[PDB]
Amino acid sequence: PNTGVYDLSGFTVKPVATVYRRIPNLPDCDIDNWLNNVSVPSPLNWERRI
Amino acid sequence: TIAGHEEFIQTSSPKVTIDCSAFVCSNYAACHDLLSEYGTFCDNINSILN
Numbered sequence: 001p002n003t004g005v006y007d008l009s010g011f012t013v014k015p016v017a018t019v020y021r022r023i024p025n026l027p028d029c030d031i032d033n034w035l036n037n038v039s040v041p042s043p044l045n046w047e048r049r050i
Numbered sequence: 051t052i053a054g055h056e057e058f059i060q061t062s063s064p065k066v067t068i069d070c071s072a073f074v075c076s077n078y079a080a081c082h083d084l085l086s087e088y089g090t091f092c093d094n095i096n097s098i099l100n
């Protein structure tokens with residue numbers, strides 16, 4: 001190549017570590033117990049759980 | 051008497067330079083993989099600004 005000033009590839013500072021945070025001691029949702037419930041609603045009155 | 055008045059004439063402007071693939075696809079590798087098959091789009095923008 002010729003003589004000149006070249007603006008080269010963009011660099012980012014690479015991340016050193018990770019900061020992972022959660023909430024400890026939470027209950028279990030138990031969606032499998034609601035799905036395996038005995039009574040099953042019709043499509044006319046479908047059911048919702050939050 | 052002798053009057054005096056001032057006048058500004060603009061001879062330059064700020065020299066803006068643009069990193070095209072850092073503007074478009076900042077740090078994400080899938081973006082750079084999709085951008086690499088656009089050919090010579092970023093090189094023309096850098097050449098016009100130079």
Ligand SMILES: *[C@@H]1O[C@H](CO)[C@@H](O[C@@H]2O[C@H](CO)[C@@H](O)[C@H](O)[C@H]2NC(C)=O)[C@H](O)[C@H]1NC(C)=O
Nearest residue numbers: 030032033034035036037038039040041047049
């Ligand atoms: C399956 O769903 C029924 C909903 O009809 C649940 O019955 C409710 O049970 C709770 C406590 O277990 C009672 O406080 C509610 O009053 C009941 N609902 C009605 C309409 O009476 C039943 O518990 C579910 N099964 C399981 C294993 O959780």
